[PDB]
Design a protein around this motif. Structure first.
Motif, short mmCIF file in Angstrom:
data_model
loop_
_atom_site.label_atom_id
_atom_site.label_comp_id
_atom_site.label_asym_id
_atom_site.label_seq_id
_atom_site.Cartn_x
_atom_site.Cartn_y
_atom_site.Cartn_z
N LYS A 46 10.04 -83.27 7.53
CA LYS A 46 9.31 -83.51 6.29
C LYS A 46 8.20 -84.55 6.37
O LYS A 46 7.10 -84.30 5.88
CB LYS A 46 10.30 -83.94 5.21
N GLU A 47 8.51 -85.71 6.94
CA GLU A 47 7.64 -86.91 6.96
C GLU A 47 7.37 -87.33 8.40
O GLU A 47 8.20 -87.10 9.28
CB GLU A 47 8.28 -88.09 6.22
N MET A 48 6.25 -88.01 8.64
CA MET A 48 5.98 -88.62 9.94
C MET A 48 7.03 -89.68 10.26
O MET A 48 7.41 -89.89 11.43
CB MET A 48 4.57 -89.25 9.93
N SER A 49 7.53 -90.37 9.23
CA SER A 49 8.49 -91.44 9.50
C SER A 49 9.93 -90.92 9.66
O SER A 49 10.85 -91.70 9.85
CB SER A 49 8.43 -92.60 8.48
N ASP A 50 10.09 -89.61 9.56
CA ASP A 50 11.32 -88.91 10.01
C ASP A 50 11.38 -88.73 11.55
O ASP A 50 12.45 -88.43 12.09
CB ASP A 50 11.43 -87.54 9.33
N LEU A 51 10.25 -88.87 12.23
CA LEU A 51 10.13 -88.62 13.67
C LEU A 51 10.46 -89.89 14.43
O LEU A 51 10.30 -90.97 13.90
CB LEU A 51 8.73 -88.12 14.02
N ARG A 52 10.91 -89.79 15.68
CA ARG A 52 11.05 -91.00 16.49
C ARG A 52 9.66 -91.52 16.82
O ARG A 52 8.73 -90.74 16.91
CB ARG A 52 11.82 -90.75 17.78
N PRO A 53 9.51 -92.85 16.95
CA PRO A 53 8.21 -93.40 17.30
C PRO A 53 7.45 -92.69 18.45
O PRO A 53 6.24 -92.55 18.38
CB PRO A 53 8.55 -94.85 17.67
#
Ligand SMILES: [Cl-]
Ligand SMILES: [Cl-]
Ligand SMILES: [Zn+2]
Ligand SMILES: [Zn+2]
Lengths: 139, 139
Positions: A46-53
């Motif tokens: 859903k979000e970029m901040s759902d992804l690992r760095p």
């Protein structure tokens, strides 16, 4: 992972120019914005901040390589980048070449139309050039 | 470097939440979008790809920190991220908390309004909560 009813899980999204395991780059065939490309995450997140760095970073490197390719091939007046996802909540970046006399300028392409416009849709030559320019930077 | 007729060279752009040498994070006071933040490059640069890769990387770190802080404080339905700069070609990122009941959803905030939405402007506690959330992530 894969939502059977998400268009970005179930469709390419345009002509695929580049891809790897994490993501794909497509030319969106938009009549008012030739050279409009999207970087679409392969899996449904859903979000970029759902992804690992590390995934965030890899994705952003593809986005900036696609910005550079669009700048080079299209020679636009401005680049717009956006990850919105309000209608389709599956991470994807719009990389849009803008021109001072395009349909909406200086509005966003989601805003009010400002003028008649008639930009020539991309030819195989330009599409090819985009593929080469992205590949140069990523492969 | 400094363009005297550029809104983002000559104004803070909102209430400052965090900054370093390269950039500043501000809360934009938008009555329809409490928690709308912007990450503004401190110097005048037109495109993201005009930046050195070390600078792109760092700016994006700040953007993703702000995203995470907004999600924590605002608990939005969706985050919108965007660098457009059509009216002001000075690199800056909109970090926008969206809600199903917000003025435009599922349109972009630059599109047509779908409903009435008169939200509560952020209290001092929420704005302070954003500052703290951002700072914990970046300091
Ligand atoms: Cl979108
Ligand atoms: Cl803008
Ligand atoms: Zn999907
Ligand atoms: Zn400026």
């Amino acid at each position: 992972s894969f939502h059977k009813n998400c268009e970005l899980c179930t469709t390419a999204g345009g002509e695929i120019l580049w891809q790897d395991a994490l993501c794909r780059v497509v030319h969106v065939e938009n009549q008012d914005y030739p050279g409009f490309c999207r970087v679409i995450l392969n899996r449904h997140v859903k979000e970029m901040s759902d992804l690992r760095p590390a995934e965030r970073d890899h994705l952003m490197l593809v986005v900036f390589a696609v910005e550079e390719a669009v700048r080079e091939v299209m020679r636009p007046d401005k680049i717009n980048l956006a990850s919105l996802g309000n209608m389709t909540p599956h991470v994807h970046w719009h990389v849009i070449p803008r021109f001072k006399r395009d349909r909406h300028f200086p509005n966003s392409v989601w805003g009010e139309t400002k003028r008649e416009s008639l930009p020539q849709a991309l030819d195989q030559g330009s599409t090819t050039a985009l593929k080469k320019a992205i590949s140069v930077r990523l492969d």
